[PDB]
Design a protein around this nucleic acid. Structure first.
Ligand SMILES: [Mg+2]
Ligand SMILES: [Mg+2]
Ligand SMILES: [Mg+2]
Ligand SMILES: [Mg+2]
Ligand SMILES: [Mg+2]
Ligand SMILES: [Mg+2]
Ligand SMILES: [Mg+2]
Ligand SMILES: [Mg+2]
Ligand SMILES: [Mg+2]
Ligand SMILES: [Mg+2]
Ligand SMILES: [Mg+2]
Ligand SMILES: [Mg+2]
Lengths: 101, 18, 120, 99, 194, 167, 138, 132
RNA sequence: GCACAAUCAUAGCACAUAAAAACGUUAGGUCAAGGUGUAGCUUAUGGGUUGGAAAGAAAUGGGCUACAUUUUCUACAUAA
């Protein structure tokens, strides 16, 4: 299994965004311009509204990979502030050490 | 306003950029 | 033919021996492909379909099925300037992008004619 | 600003591969949508969470095959065995509320 | 049945060549190293821990395979692969008049399974403008054609290409930019007369 | 006239590693490399030297059995050069209905190959001179009366070429 | 006393293609600690003095990346734990290189690189002029 | 009170290793890191991949060598090949030790698509540094 | 023996800062980082989709802006 049901939902959201990445790109290319006449832009808006909900990259939540914490995580290690400390205090993370200055 | 003609295919065939 | 492979396995049985040196370990792993190709180059194994720069930067040859004086050129020249400066996409991957635009614009014909500007 | 400089910049943009005709900053966005990779395509985005199911099934199958020794699952099975021997176990699906 | 074998230290010869036991990077097995080394913080009444069972000597990267004798013996067999640099270019004053084109190429290495580094596509071109056949009008047009890519103090044109995926493609595209920037600087159009 | 350009030297990817390996000879007081360098694992006798290597190969093949039996746990590729040596091997044929396409997969992978010719001839499918040659080689590599029952089927069924007969 | 005979069997060919030239080859090796970088600098300079390359070595300024995290688990923000990531740099500047000499140097250099350090190789390729700029008129 | 990576002092009879006898504020001062890679540098990438791979190696070896592991693993990462240095107690016969090392040397390689090395240093007992 | 001290870090010393601070007190905070002993749910206290989670009668803690002339605006290193 996964760490949590919300992480199981977030991996599905990321897969759906990876599947619908290019279509949303080509649709946004029709809305983020001013050269095209405004008639087709509303149809492109209805097309992008007809897409599945879990397809937009805004629904993804960068949770921890270890404990699936939605907050307090670092982007470099994808670890929460607690697991990162638990692994850095044991000397299992290279170059990481207590700051003393 | 006024637009200039840019020789693209000629430069490509010249400098092997086709 | 099966007999040549059956004769090659007997050569492999005698040529193969337990490793006696770490140098022979890396020699064998490099000939098999495990060790990296030294000196290491960050493009080893990737040829991008053998394409050159004139397949990436120059994309105007695909805009022939589009109106030259309409706003389609003003709009598509921007996507071509983006695809020319997109190093992450392949020369094949840019083609279905321009073809998706070629298909969408030629499918939605009524709005382009009701917009007041003529487009083909 | 003179016509000579406008033409020089227009031909410099043509030779360098930038936008030739003057376009607005709001319309310059579609150039950026294609010059870079989208967010949903990045390896740091679509490969964020590793496949936890692969690790879990691999380690559990190796434990059942007798190569890996999972002390956490063994502790869970020990406590579950002692709970079922005490008498409070897991009810059957379909008889908890009614039966 | 338990067996405890003594290490190689009792059998190591005092004149035995060292590179024979450490040809490549090794995890510093204490049984094959005859040097008694004590690593670790000592106790107020004790001494630093010995090499046996010492994780401190196992955490650090050992250079036992890179001793002076082994590196000399390695490069003496590597002398056959390299070529001799022509002494006709000892000073850069002759290198600037012989090879005025400079190609800055970057290469990276990192421990891991992946090799693709997005900073590898960057290829830099440096050409001194005092070594070309530009005339007065061709130069005065090329300066305003490149803009800030060419400096006035050092008089060096710099080309920074990153659009192509491959490094060879970025190199060919930079040379293509150099060719078009040298060619289109000689063409006088109709809008130049004003 | 003064600029001198030397010639380049092209060597194999492992030639320089062989030139580095030529410098170091075999040590006297050191055990073979395939054994662990720890004294508790160094082989004492020759039967021990044989048994340690055989136990190590037994664990290698036991791990490869798990890799081949559960391929889905290793389909994810992380190395960019895409090494094929560490990818799982498949024992199943792709096409099962087509009698022509069902044998080219099974000949390369004994007892199951014997049923392929019967399941192809059940529908009276015409086998060419190139299909049954490898099938006969699959019996001549592995495999007294079943060989006669197979030898009558290569000759009596179709006029096969003698180059694919004697071999 | 049991020394093998005929141990050197290299395969070195000389192709008719002109060997590539290099003006300046910079090797910037970055690491966490200073001792490994110092021993690696000693090893690289001793490997360069034997091939006769006249390497130059200097030490770029270090970079310390520090950050702050919460000390407790649930609620304690006045007390924090600050972590640190030191990055030390070592620059090896090689000059007057050739295409195969740089390859034979980076071969003995990269294969023996430690585990905790990385390396940035910047090569200044030497070229005379392309074909369409020698003496063209459009 | 600080409690991270800190073994509490008992009456004076517990055996502790050199890695456990030092608080985490002594890393890079008196003790070093159990893993070495390049992802934790300044301008490098792919760090979380190495962290999760390292934690998987730890949790895998803890189950592969049960009760006979002396201390934590040393995961060295150098040029596409990953070395695992372990300290093991002489509880298992070498006939089984070689089976285990040969099994892991190929399982980890086929799981991570990269060459792995596995080295075992066997000790008679857990090395005591402080009071015992 | 653990603390204190010494040492280490803020790339030279000294100072300072940082770091460290044992055994225990407050059944102090955290089952909601994560796992968990005990007791409870299993066609539900479990798993999915859509839409809403206001608002201030009022009190109060911490901050920013000020209440100007040692001020405000403009160009600008501080002589307008
Ligand atoms: Mg949970
Ligand atoms: Mg968000
Ligand atoms: Mg000091
Ligand atoms: Mg003091
Ligand atoms: Mg303090
Ligand atoms: Mg103190
Ligand atoms: Mg309470
Ligand atoms: Mg409470
Ligand atoms: Mg819980
Ligand atoms: Mg609760
Ligand atoms: Mg308030
Ligand atoms: Mg506050």
């Amino acid at each position: 299994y996964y760490v949590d049901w919300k992480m199981l939902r977030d991996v599905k959201r990321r897969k759906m965004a990876y599947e619908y990445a290019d279509e949303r790109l080509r649709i946004n290319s029709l809305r983020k311009n001013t050269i095209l006449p405004k008639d087709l832009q509303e149809v492109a808006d209805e097309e992008i509204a007809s897409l599945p909900r879990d397809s937009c990259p805004v629904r993804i939540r960068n949770r921890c990979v270890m404990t699936s914490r939605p907050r307090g995580v670092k982007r470099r290690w994808r670890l929460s502030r607690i697991v990162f400390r638990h692994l850095a205090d044991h000397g299992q993370l290279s170059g990481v050490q207590r700051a003393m200055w | 306003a006024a637009a200039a003609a840019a020789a693209a295919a000629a430069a490509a065939a010249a400098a092997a950029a086709a | 033919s099966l007999w040549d492979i059956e004769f090659a396995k007997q050569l492999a049985a005698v040529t193969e021996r337990p490793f006696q040196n770490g140098f022979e370990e890396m020699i064998q792993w490099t000939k098999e492909g495990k060790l990296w190709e030294f000196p290491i180059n960050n493009e080893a194994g990737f040829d991008d379909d053998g394409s050159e720069f004139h397949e990436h930067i120059f994309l105007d040859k695909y805009l022939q099925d589009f109106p030259k004086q309409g706003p389609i050129r003003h709009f598509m020249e921007l996507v071509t300037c983006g695809l020319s400066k997109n190093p992450y996409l392949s020369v094949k991957q840019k083609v279905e992008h321009i073809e998706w635009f070629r298909n969408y614009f030629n499918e939605k014909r009524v709005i382009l004619k009701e917009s007041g500007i003529q487009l083909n | 600003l003179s016509e000579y400089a406008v033409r020089m910049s227009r031909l410099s943009a043509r030779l360098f591969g930038e936008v030739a005709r003057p376009t607005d900053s709001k319309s310059m966005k579609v150039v950026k949508l294609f010059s870079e990779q989208p967010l949903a395509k990045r390896k740091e985005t679509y490969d964020w969470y590793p496949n936890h199911n692969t690790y879990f099934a691999l380690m559990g199958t190796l434990r059942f095959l007798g190569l890996y020794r999972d002390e956490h699952q063994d502790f869970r099975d020990e406590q579950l065995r002692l709970k079922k021997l005490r008498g409070k176990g897991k009810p059957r699906k379909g008889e908890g509320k009614r039966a | 049945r338990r067996k405890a074998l003594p290490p190689r230290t009792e059998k190591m010869a005092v004149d035995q060549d060292w590179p024979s036991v450490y040809p490549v990077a090794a995890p510093f097995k204490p049984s094959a190293v005859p040097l008694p080394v004590r690593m670790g913080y000592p106790v107020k009444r004790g001494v630093p821990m010995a090499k046996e069972g010492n994780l401190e000597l196992l955490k650090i990267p050992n250079f036992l395979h890179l001793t002076p004798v082994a590196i000399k013996r390695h490069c003496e067999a590597l002398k056959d692969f390299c070529t001799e640099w022509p002494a006709a270019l000892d000073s850069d004053e002759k290198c600037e008049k012989h090879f005025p084109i400079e190609i800055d190429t970057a290469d990276y290495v990192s421990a891991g399974p992946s090799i693709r580094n997005p900073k590898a596509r960057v290829v830099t071109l440096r050409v001194k403008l005092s070594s070309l056949n530009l005339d007065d009008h061709a130069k005065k047009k090329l300066i305003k054609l490149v803009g800030d890519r060419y400096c006035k103090s050092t008089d060096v044109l710099t080309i920074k290409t990153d659009r192509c995926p491959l490094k060879r493609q970025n190199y060919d595209y930079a040379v293509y930019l150099l060719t078009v920037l040298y060619h289109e600087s000689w063409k006088t159009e109709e809008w130049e007369k004003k | 006239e003064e600029v001198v350009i030397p010639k380049k030297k092209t060597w194999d990817k492992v030639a320089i590693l062989q030139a580095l390996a030529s410098t170091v000879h075999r040590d006297s007081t050191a055990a073979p490399y395939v054994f662990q360098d720890d004294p508790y694992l160094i082989p004492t006798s020759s039967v021990e030297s044989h048994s340690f290597l055989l136990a190590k190969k037994s664990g290698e093949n036991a791990a490869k059995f798990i890799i081949n039996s559960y391929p889905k746990y290793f389909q994810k590729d992380i190395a960019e050069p895409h090494i094929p040596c560490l990818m799982p091997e498949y024992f199943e044929p792709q096409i099962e209905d087509v009698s022509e396409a069902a044998l080219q997969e099974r000949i390369k992978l004994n007892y199951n190959f014997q049923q392929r010719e019967q399941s192809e001839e059940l529908e009276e499918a015409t086998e060419a001179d190139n299909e049954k040659s490898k099938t006969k080689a699959g019996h001549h590599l592995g495999v007294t009366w079943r060989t006669k029952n197979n030898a009558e089927r290569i000759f009596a069924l179709m006029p096969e070429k003698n180059a694919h007969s004697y071999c | 006393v049991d020394v093998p005979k005929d141990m050197t069997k290299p395969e070195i060919t000389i192709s008719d293609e002109p060997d590539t030239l290099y003006k300046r080859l910079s090797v910037l090796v970055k690491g966490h600690d200073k001792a490994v970088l110092d021993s690696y600098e000693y090893f690289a300079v001793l490997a360069a003095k034997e091939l006769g390359i006249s390497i130059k070595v200097h030490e770029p300024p270090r970079k310390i990346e520090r950050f702050t995290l919460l000390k407790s688990v649930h609620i304690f923000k006045k007390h924090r734990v600050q972590y640190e990531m030191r990055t030390l740099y070592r620059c090896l500047e090689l000059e007057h290189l050739t295409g195969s000499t740089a390859d034979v140097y980076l071969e003995y250099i990269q294969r023996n690189l430690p585990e905790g350090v990385a390396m940035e190789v910047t090569k200044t390729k030497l070229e005379q002029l392309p074909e369409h700029i020698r003496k063209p008129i459009w | 009170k600080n409690r991270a990576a800190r073994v509490r002092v008992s009456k004076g009879d517990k055996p502790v290793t050199y890695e456990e006898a030092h608080a985490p504020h002594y890393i890079a001062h008196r003790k070093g890191w159990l893993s070495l890679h390049t992802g934790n540098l300044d301008g490098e990438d792919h760090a979380a991949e190495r962290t999760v791979e390292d934690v998987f190696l730890r949790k895998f070896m803890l189950g592969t060598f049960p009760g006979c592991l002396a201390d934590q693993l040393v995961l060295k990462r150098r040029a596409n090949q990953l070395e695992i240095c372990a300290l093991v107690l002489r509880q298992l016969p070498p006939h089984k030790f070689y089976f285990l090392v040969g099994y892991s040397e190929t399982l980890l390689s086929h799981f991570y698509k990269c060459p792995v090395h596995l080295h075992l240093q066997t000790v008679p007992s857990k090395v005591v540094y402080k009071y015992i």
